[PDB]
Amino acid sequence: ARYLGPKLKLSRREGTDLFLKSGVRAIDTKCKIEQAPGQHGARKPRLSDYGVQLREKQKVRRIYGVLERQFRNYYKEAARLKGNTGENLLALLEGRLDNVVYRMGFGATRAEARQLVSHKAIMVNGRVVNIASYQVSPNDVVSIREKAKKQSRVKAALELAEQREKPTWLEVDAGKMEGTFKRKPERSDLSADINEHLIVELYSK
Amino acid sequence: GQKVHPNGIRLGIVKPWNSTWFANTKEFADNLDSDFKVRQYLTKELAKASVSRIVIERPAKSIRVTIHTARPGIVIGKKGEDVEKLRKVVADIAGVPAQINIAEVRKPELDAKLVADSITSQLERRVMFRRAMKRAVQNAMRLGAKGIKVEVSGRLGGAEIARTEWYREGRVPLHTLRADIDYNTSEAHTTYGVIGVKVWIFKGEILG
Amino acid sequence: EFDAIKIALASPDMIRSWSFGEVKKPETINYRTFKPERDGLFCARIFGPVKDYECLCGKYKRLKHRGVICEKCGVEVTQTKVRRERMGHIELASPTAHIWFLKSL
Amino acid sequence: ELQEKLIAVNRVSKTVKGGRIFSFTALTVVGDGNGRVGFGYGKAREVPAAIQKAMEKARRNMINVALNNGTLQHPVKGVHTGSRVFMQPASEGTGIIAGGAMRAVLEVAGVHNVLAKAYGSTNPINVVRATIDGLENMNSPEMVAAKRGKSVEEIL
Amino acid sequence: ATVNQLVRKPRARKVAKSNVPALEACPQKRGVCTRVYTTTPKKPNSALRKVCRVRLTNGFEVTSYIGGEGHNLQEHSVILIRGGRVKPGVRYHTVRGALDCSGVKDRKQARSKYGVKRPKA
RNA sequence: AUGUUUUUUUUUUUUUUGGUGAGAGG
RNA sequence: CCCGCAGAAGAAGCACCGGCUAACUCCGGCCAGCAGCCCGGUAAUACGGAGGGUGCAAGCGUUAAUCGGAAUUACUGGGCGUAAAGCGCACGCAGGCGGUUUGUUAAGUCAGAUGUGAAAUCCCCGGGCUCAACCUGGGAACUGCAUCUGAUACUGGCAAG
Ligand SMILES: [Zn+2]
């Protein structure tokens, strides 16, 4: 139910930096980010039409840490919902509790955030929510509870975030350690490199 | 084995000889042997130096070698240090007083042998043979060859079934005797086997 | 193209309108590598990307999305001469009178 | 600015006294991400050369296509030889739902959103041609208005 | 084709027969080996392919391929067949590692497909 | 007068487009 | 359901990597074996093992079965000179279709209403289980059938041309 292996390998495979490590130390120093994993890394022949789409899908999934069935479900939901499908999917992905936490800066990585969520550190509207897939709504305040507020990791995460660009769709307080999910993010607010359309196509086989 | 050797057919007309001496039936074989030896030695030595043509010429119990090379600097080394060294060994090989001259080859892309050697080297260091061939052809053309042909043969890309491929550009008349056709050959001793490289470079026609 | 050149005083609203970002930290560059400082004198978000149409840190290495600013880079995405026209502003904690209007004789 | 996609490359033979002479056909298609599209079909003894030729061909004899935003203006059929093709305009987000050669042509054309089925033959060369034809025939609202002697609001 | 014609006599659906009829819409069937033997395949191939004529539970007498390297089967050995045809007249495979048919010896990849338990170390 | 009379894989991918200070000449 | 306790602790496999099809190398002789369709005879990315990778993941493969792809029974939506496909040719009952004008009818057709079309299910907006599945409020839908009141271009009936 989770990917427990090497994180940088995934990144290498993808091509890009997936942000699977905190960002204290640059990704180029930790691993050969350009070279693909395994014995046959240096060889890089152009991929197929299907293959590129698949890769794209993987990238997105990897980024958020969502396994396949769940991803499929999300896609379906997006399709069902009104408006642009890929965009909707992206929004849904964002909405995940762990992701939100990460954005806020209470977790160094998304993985860390997820862990925190699991371990009953986070509350959503003053009620302890344990599910990483929990879809956080507009105007839903989300905070660290008083037990987990003393942790050194949390502050480190916050610091890291502060170095990292702040998302417009949230509003977080470092002292209070509570952030308000103000609105579901627009496509423009998210990263431009993610070809959602490819993903959509893949499932529209 | 269809074709006549392009150098060999033209030795009387437009191409000259490499070994250039007279000898009676007594000493001729020996001389030939000596030439073979010295040439062999030179090839062994000046592999890294781009060497095209060794011209041996022995008058009056004294051997005059003339090395045509693209880069004299690596053959000469420090001024009269490497050449001198070469000389004594040459003498030893011969059993006579030696004299080494070094001709500087202008335009090594137009010298056929050199090109062939380069191609072989490329093959050895695992490039795409075809791309190498193209480079060879293109470069020569750029330099002002009236034409060039190159041919490579056998175990191309380590394939089980051997084949030959060849690229021509411009005009390369072989039947025309008065055509200056610089022909030469080389062999790439790859992991899969030998790959023979031929190259014809047509400088132009001589009028006399 | 243009007539006369007009010179006047600079209002704080006018200086905030010239500007593209507050220069906080005094840290010039990294000095052990090649990267600058985020966010110091020679910033990324306040001014622009060192390389032309490139996020200095890592995204956009072709000519499609000129402008996107990810959180991992905090960088604009324009020309190499774009930083020559862009200027920063330092929020002086304590007011300081100009020396040209205090000692001009 | 122009994007160019090699759809297919196929090895074709000619029998001679000696044996078989092989050659390569390259089908490419190029477009500017707006109305302009053009396919090219190039042939040579080696692949890359053939591809280049195809590209060259494509770059000349382009064709304009009226695009209402990211999608088509109305459902359009296009036929050529075996390949008969249907393509239908679709809502923003849906992506190019189309198969093979057809997809490639659409992508370069700068349609982002289509629902497209290739009936009949799916021989890349024919199908791309069919697609092109379909695109070409497809008229815009303005054009239709012009034709009919009306305003755009009269047609809706 | 003509609508009237269609009305008169509607369109016949192509009834596709099952290529594994001795199963009778069962995922596997139990059977007893009537005889076990090797057979030579058709052109262009060359081998001695191990196969057993099986009398099934439901009454059919079929012939079932035996996959993997080596097998313990004899006459009167109770085996499970699964359907799948080897590319004359063999339309079924013995399930290795079910009933009397053993898993393949010394096999470490695709183990499931030959009944083999996970190697311990 | 006559020819399905010795078949076996001897296999499909490019290239891509800078301040500081000193000295001389006129 | 909540609180406390200890300590990374008790918790990852399955299939695949010739092309289709995401993933490649080395070592073991048309055998042993593989195979869904289209390898193996001594350099096998196709057999078996290894290392490396890819895809799924408390599951993963295989088999069986249904729809899909299959516009490959084509109502939507195919064809028939040569690819399968025009009766050897006619007459002709039933059947199908029917030039043009007016009038009338109102069967078909269309419009509106009424009754019904069980609940659940599906779909939309909500709510409740920490989320989800699940449960659940209200709607929409259930393409229909029947009846009543209109419309009369088209098709039909009847009457005259
Ligand atoms: Zn960037």
Side-chain angles (χ1 to χ4, degrees):
Chain A
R2 281 176 68 254
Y3 176 75
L4 274 37
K7 284 144 200 71
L8 291 180
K9 202 181 206 177
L10 300 181
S11 318
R12 285 170 69 185
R13 176 46 71 185
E14 290 314 322
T16 56
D17 179 22
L18 301 174
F19 317 108
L20 300 172
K21 297 199 161 285
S22 68
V24 171
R25 183 150 158 166
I27 196 164
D28 66 320
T29 58
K30 295 204 68 46
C31 64
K32 285 200 181 64
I33 195 57
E34 302 303 325
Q35 199 205 80
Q39 181 179 114
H40 309 292
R43 294 168 171 283
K44 287 224 186 203
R46 265 313 118 225
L47 298 340
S48 56
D49 194 279
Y50 158 68
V52 296
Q53 289 171 340
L54 165 59
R55 275 271 66 83
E56 185 56 38
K57 189 255 281 163
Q58 286 300 332
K59 186 222 294 200
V60 172
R61 272 184 48 197
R62 281 162 190 198
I63 278 158
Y64 299 113
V66 182
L67 289 196
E68 185 63 24
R69 180 62 63 78
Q70 197 154 41
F71 202 78
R72 183 53 155 284
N73 284 330
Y74 271 128
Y75 165 72
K76 276 180 164 76
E77 183 60 27
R80 192 192 61 73
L81 293 155
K82 299 188 185 76
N84 180 311
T85 307
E87 286 183 5
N88 280 354
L89 167 52
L90 274 170
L92 282 174
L93 279 161
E94 243 56 63
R96 290 172 62 88
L97 177 55
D98 64 330
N99 178 85
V100 164
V101 162
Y102 169 77
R103 255 64 224 270
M104 255 146 211
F106 316 135
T109 56
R110 283 194 225 278
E112 183 154 294
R114 200 209 185 78
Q115 156 118 131
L116 263 164
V117 168
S118 195
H119 289 218
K120 299 183 188 175
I122 316 304
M123 288 190 162
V124 185
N125 307 311
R127 295 167 62 183
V128 66
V129 179
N130 216 44
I131 298 102
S133 67
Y134 176 96
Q135 289 287 304
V136 179
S137 220
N139 312 129
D140 288 21
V141 303
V142 40
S143 69
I144 275 55
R145 77 195 304 185
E146 202 67 19
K147 182 167 62 55
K149 222 169 200 176
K150 303 288 169 290
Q151 293 173 3
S152 180
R153 79 179 182 185
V154 172
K155 73 170 195 294
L158 278 167
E159 281 297 316
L160 281 161
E162 281 288 351
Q163 300 310 319
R164 300 181 282 85
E165 195 178 328
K166 277 295 153 184
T168 314
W169 73 88
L170 304 185
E171 262 190 336
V172 66
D173 300 319
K176 300 175 192 175
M177 300 197 177
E178 64 182 41
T180 308
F181 192 100
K182 293 165 55 265
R183 54 183 174 77
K184 62 182 279 290
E186 196 181 324
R187 183 66 187 79
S188 59
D189 298 33
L190 306 173
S191 191
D193 63 73
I194 294 165
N195 297 310
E196 47 151 76
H197 73 90
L198 291 182
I199 293 165
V200 165
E201 284 172 346
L202 179 47
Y203 292 118
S204 307
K205 284 265 188 173
Chain B
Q2 294 154 107
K3 275 150 214 69
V4 71
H5 198 294
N7 185 62
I9 200 69
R10 291 167 236 275
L11 291 151
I13 19 282
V14 300
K15 241 65 172 162
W17 282 261
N18 295 21
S19 305
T20 34
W21 41 259
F22 185 89
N24 275 304
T25 313
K26 187 164 280 177
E27 304 266 303
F28 194 101
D30 284 295
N31 272 12
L32 233 59
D33 193 18
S34 154
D35 281 354
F36 172 72
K37 249 85 175 66
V38 296
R39 271 157 201 283
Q40 188 181 61
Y41 180 69
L42 255 53
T43 307
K44 192 158 190 176
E45 285 291 305
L46 318 162
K48 278 78 62 177
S50 296
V51 64
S52 63
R53 193 151 78 95
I54 300 162
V55 157
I56 299 162
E57 184 167 35
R58 61 223 300 175
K61 272 288 236 176
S62 64
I63 190 171
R64 203 192 307 121
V65 184
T66 298
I67 306 175
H68 294 77
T69 185
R71 39 172 173 282
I74 188 284
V75 178
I76 299 167
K78 271 55 180 166
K79 286 281 165 185
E81 191 78 289
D82 198 7
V83 173
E84 196 83 331
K85 198 183 290 182
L86 279 172
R87 191 192 49 74
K88 74 91 75 178
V89 291
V90 163
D92 285 13
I93 287 165
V96 277
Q99 187 189 335
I100 296 176
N101 300 352
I102 296 161
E104 196 269 304
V105 177
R106 303 271 64 239
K107 308 176 182 176
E109 287 76 46
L110 298 184
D111 190 289
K113 170 53 178 168
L114 289 182
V115 164
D117 289 324
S118 91
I119 286 169
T120 304
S121 308
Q122 272 161 288
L123 285 174
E124 288 280 16
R125 69 167 157 283
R126 302 144 173 283
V127 312
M128 297 164 200
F129 72 90
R130 199 184 301 283
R131 152 182 297 180
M133 286 173 90
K134 253 82 170 290
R135 282 175 184 284
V137 169
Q138 277 170 2
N139 279 7
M141 283 319 304
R142 188 183 64 194
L143 263 294
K146 294 272 77 159
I148 169 163
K149 184 169 73 177
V150 315
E151 177 194 295
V152 304
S153 309
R155 288 286 230 161
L156 302 171
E160 294 181 343
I161 304 300
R163 94 275 186 176
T164 171
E165 305 205 335
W166 60 277
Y167 289 105
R168 175 187 296 162
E169 202 151 315
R171 80 195 222 78
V172 187
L174 268 35
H175 282 44
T176 306
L177 281 322
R178 65 154 163 262
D180 191 289
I181 302 288
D182 185 355
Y183 170 84
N184 229 302
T185 311
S186 184
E187 294 179 309
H189 299 277
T190 70
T191 52
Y192 287 94
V194 182
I195 307 198
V197 184
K198 290 178 180 156
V199 30
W200 292 255
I201 302 190
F202 174 50
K203 267 79 180 200
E205 294 193 0
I206 283 68
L207 287 161
Chain C
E1 179 67 27
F2 68 101
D3 55 359
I5 293 172
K6 186 178 181 180
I7 184 170
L9 284 178
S11 178
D13 287 333
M14 192 68 71
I15 296 169
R16 292 184 180 93
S17 294
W18 292 342
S19 175
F20 288 92
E22 180 178 4
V23 177
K24 294 143 146 202
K25 278 139 102 11
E27 265 118 329
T28 47
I29 57 254
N30 194 29
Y31 106 68
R32 156 65 359 77
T33 57
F34 251 142
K35 273 318 123 122
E37 231 347 298
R38 154 216 254 224
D39 13 17
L41 227 66
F42 313 83
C43 182
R45 45 209 235 186
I46 301 193
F47 312 71
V50 189
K51 316 209 254 251
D52 322 31
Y53 304 67
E54 274 247 3
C55 136
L56 71 86
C57 93
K59 129 180 292 231
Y60 170 90
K61 42 234 64 272
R62 58 204 132 90
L63 194 263
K64 177 184 257 251
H65 32 105
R66 48 256 148 125
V68 307
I69 55 158
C70 38
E71 310 90 337
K72 270 273 53 141
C73 244
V75 76
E76 244 140 292
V77 159
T78 54
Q79 298 244 121
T80 268
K81 22 159 61 160
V82 172
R83 300 161 49 254
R84 194 212 231 46
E85 330 133 358
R86 284 215 238 274
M87 316 169 23
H89 84 267
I90 302 156
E91 294 276 331
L92 307 162
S94 157
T96 316
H98 214 277
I99 186 129
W100 277 23
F101 309 127
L102 144 67
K103 285 170 96 23
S104 25
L105 272 87
Chain D
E1 81 290 65
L2 263 64
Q3 56 171 124
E4 314 182 356
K5 308 197 81 58
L6 106 83
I7 288 173
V9 50
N10 170 41
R11 193 183 71 156
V12 289
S13 161
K14 171 178 153 64
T15 313
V16 295
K17 183 159 64 271
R20 284 173 261 278
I21 294 171
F22 297 109
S23 166
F24 292 89
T25 84
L27 178 63
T28 66
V29 72
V30 314
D32 68 336
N34 296 347
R36 296 179 67 87
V37 180
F39 85 97
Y41 180 77
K43 192 147 71 68
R45 292 282 186 77
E46 297 300 329
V47 170
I51 96 88
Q52 196 153 25
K53 279 183 186 186
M55 282 312 174
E56 264 278 24
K57 276 177 178 162
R59 281 197 206 80
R60 58 178 153 284
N61 67 98
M62 293 268 256
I63 212 81
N64 277 252
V65 185
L67 264 57
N68 176 41
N69 203 348
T71 184
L72 281 63
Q73 274 145 348
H74 52 90
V76 65
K77 283 179 280 188
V79 310
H80 188 272
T81 315
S83 298
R84 43 203 169 77
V85 158
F86 169 78
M87 55 215 305
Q88 182 189 64
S91 184
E92 178 60 52
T94 190
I96 295 166
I97 305 310
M102 178 142 184
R103 159 181 284 283
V105 28
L106 262 344
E107 183 153 29
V108 298
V111 317
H112 298 109
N113 300 301
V114 289
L115 292 164
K117 188 147 224 314
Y119 295 110
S121 190
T122 52
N123 195 83
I125 292 156
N126 279 349
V127 62
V128 64
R129 232 137 174 158
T131 56
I132 258 77
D133 158 60
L135 289 178
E136 192 167 13
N137 86 52
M138 178 173 71
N139 49 11
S140 81
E142 291 169 38
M143 284 162 63
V144 303
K147 164 169 97 175
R148 286 164 63 178
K150 286 194 167 191
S151 57
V152 178
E153 270 60 281
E154 281 174 302
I155 289 155
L156 286 154
Chain E
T2 305
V3 62
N4 254 111
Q5 285 184 333
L6 286 175
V7 163
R8 206 190 69 256
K9 181 206 180 184
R11 309 218 97 138
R13 303 182 199 100
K14 296 196 285 187
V15 179
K17 71 193 281 282
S18 179
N19 59 348
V20 281
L23 273 24
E24 295 191 293
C26 288
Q28 307 83 13
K29 279 227 146 287
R30 180 163 55 80
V32 187
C33 304
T34 297
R35 97 193 198 79
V36 182
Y37 58 107
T38 54
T39 318
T40 54
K42 65 170 142 284
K43 264 66 176 291
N45 289 11
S46 178
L48 286 82
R49 303 221 182 278
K50 283 60 167 175
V51 75
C52 63
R53 179 141 282 274
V54 198
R55 187 165 231 95
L56 295 174
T57 291
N58 63 353
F60 288 85
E61 257 275 43
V62 302
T63 165
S64 179
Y65 188 69
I66 302 156
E69 292 180 26
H71 64 82
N72 64 323
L73 292 334
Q74 298 292 347
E75 279 71 7
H76 314 285
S77 187
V78 179
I79 61 170
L80 212 68
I81 62 152
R82 69 151 205 277
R85 79 148 186 158
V86 190
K87 193 161 173 303
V90 170
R91 293 160 152 183
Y92 311 96
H93 285 64
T94 67
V95 178
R96 306 304 302 277
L99 289 36
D100 296 351
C101 196
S102 61
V104 173
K105 294 177 187 175
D106 312 317
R107 211 199 212 285
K108 304 203 167 182
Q109 311 190 58
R111 294 195 331 285
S112 178
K113 295 182 162 184
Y114 305 90
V116 174
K117 295 288 195 174
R118 181 160 167 73
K120 299 180 181 181

